[PDB]
Amino acid sequence: APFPELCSYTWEAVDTKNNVLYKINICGSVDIVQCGPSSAVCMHDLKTRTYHSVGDSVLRSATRSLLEFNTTVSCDNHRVQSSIAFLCGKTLGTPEFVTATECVHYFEWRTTAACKKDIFKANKEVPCYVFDEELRKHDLNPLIKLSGAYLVDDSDPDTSLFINVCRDIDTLRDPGSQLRACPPGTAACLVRGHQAFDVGQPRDGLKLVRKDRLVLSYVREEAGKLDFCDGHSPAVTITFVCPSERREGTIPKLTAKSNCRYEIEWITEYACHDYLESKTCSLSSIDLTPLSYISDGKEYLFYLNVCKKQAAVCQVKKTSQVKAAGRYHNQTLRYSDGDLTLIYFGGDECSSGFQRMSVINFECNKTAGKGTPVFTGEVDCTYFFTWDTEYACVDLLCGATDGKKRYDLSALVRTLVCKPGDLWHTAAACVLSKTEGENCTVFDSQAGFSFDLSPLTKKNGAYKVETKKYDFYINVCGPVSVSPCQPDSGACQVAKSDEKTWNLGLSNAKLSYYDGMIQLNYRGGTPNERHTPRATLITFLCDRDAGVGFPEYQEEDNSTYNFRWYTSYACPE
Ligand SMILES: *[C@@H]1O[C@H](CO)[C@@H](O)[C@H](O)[C@H]1NC(C)=O
């Protein structure tokens, strides 16, 4: 069970009560020296910051569904250990913590990498989760598409940008439907008509940036082409954002697309953090009461009941020596990020010091007509079962979409066809459309309201943006007005290393508007020796409670200069 697809990454799983993070490295070693040179599983336990390797990379073995890592440490029999129960899954997934004693530490992982046919596997998929400062857990595996992709919103009628979250786009399981042309392995495909291009491919996993912003980056350096990418390496950077009363809630939106450096922002509920728990046969949502049962073993044979005199799980040998492998009272039902896991603890103490536990991994399956538990292995008197059942079967948009034509209600937030700007027939109803203005204003004639950014326009244009290398000075609609730059430029780069500056483009007040984005483009700027004068993009984005806000430089090429500006000036009010 090497599972190549799980190499190269140091996964994370959390135990929410004890307040511990474990770091799993199945193919190698956690790269923490505090943990130790040969840790494949690592206890942190933030609460009293300490470290313990509860699994050595060398001392590894499999057993049916399980992978297990041993260590040469006494406890109490005596040896400390960690194990993962592997189930097949639709995405690469994450490991979820099950339970721990002073010796054993158990997990389960539902993943593509535990399927014995590769048709289900992605050309390339990446970890689609992160943990924040309070080990909360943000995870976008629900967004991952198995076939097809997400049309990214952009006014341009000619070209369309499709993406998948954390993996390549499977174009085969819908033959004929628009995407066929897309080069194999692409997570970001650019259609221009009948021709398709790979503008992005998975490499690293999901990142957490500035507290609460998930960033995912696709790249393509192993490349050619650059017909229209002027010697730029095509790249995609998506920013997932947890909705709020402030932040709209949306489909994904193209905020930049110069130099084949696509920048997408996507307000989606799956960006928010959650780990439920109960000693009952249900949670806060479905009950497991509707679910006597006879699971076959090696030498042995199992018997299980809904919810020892009692015994919820019973082992007998096919030899009528019988042992109980799970009580009734001592129970824990748990929903951990999509995974429903029931445990029993009762346990007749086996030869060794432990009491027999049963861990059941309920999978969702309609065509089960209830469902049946399969035995999937045993480790130090803990018996694992996977249960396909319908009774374990458990992203609300304000605006719809057309053959590329969007719709959005927002100014109607304290059947409808639209009306000329009236705002029940309402301007808010029908198609969204790009409009351009000037004098630091733009009028969305459809919706009936116009935006005016003019109060940002500074009279000596010090807006002060520090990269740890450069000091960008910019201004809105008006020009800059700072030490080295010309009073010409609306944007200006200045290295602190040197002090050497570059005009990033001449200012103008020619606003653009489309689907809640406002855009300033400066086009002068210092010259690749085709001509290539520098330019700046500044996408302004509605945030009801951002106020005026502040610009933020978007990391790209040496050569590309996009800033973002969250501000309530881009909002309808
Ligand atoms: C659900 O159970 C049926 C039983 O025949 C099986 O065919 C199918 O593969 C199962 N699906 C999943 C996703 O477990």
Numbering used by the authors: 8 to 83, 88 to 284, 286 to 296, 303 to 309, 316 to 331, 341 to 351, 354 to 403, 407 to 432, ...
Q: What did the publication describing this PDB structure actually write?
A:
CI-MPR’s extracytoplasmic region contains 15 homologous domains called “mannose 6-phosphate receptor homology” domains (MRH) due to their similar size (~150 residues) and conserved residues, including disulfide bonding. CI-MPR has four non-adjacent CRDs (domains 3, 5, 9, and 15), each with distinctive phosphomonoester and phosphodiester glycan preferences.
Crystallization screening of human CI-MPR domains 1–5 protein in the presence of 10-mM M6P resulted in two conditions yielding diffraction quality crystals. Interestingly, both conditions show evidence of the N-glycan at N591 of a crystallographic neighbor partially occupying the carbohydrate-binding site of domain 5. The pH 5.5 structure had sufficient occupancy to allow carbohydrate refinement while the corresponding region in the pH 7.0 structure did not. The other CRD (domain 3) remains unoccupied in both structures, unlike bovine CI-MPR domains 1–3, where we showed domain 3 was bound to a ligand: either M6P or the oligosaccharide of a crystallographic neighbor (inset). Although we were surprised that the domain-3 binding pocket did not contain M6P at pH 7.0 conditions, the presence of the N-linked glycan near the binding site of domain 5 could perturb conformational equilibria between substructures that stabilize a domain arrangement most favorable for crystallographic packing. The flexibility of domain 4 was also recently demonstrated in the cryo-EM structures published by Wang et al. at the time of this paper’s submission. Comparing their bovine domains 4–14 structure at pH 7.4 in the presence of IGF2 with our human domains 1–5 structure at pH 5.5 or 7.0 shows domain 4 rotated ~180°. This latter possibility of allosteric interactions between the CRDs is consistent with our crystal structures that illustrate that domain interactions can be dramatically altered in the presence or absence of ligands, such as between domain 3 and domains 1 and 2.
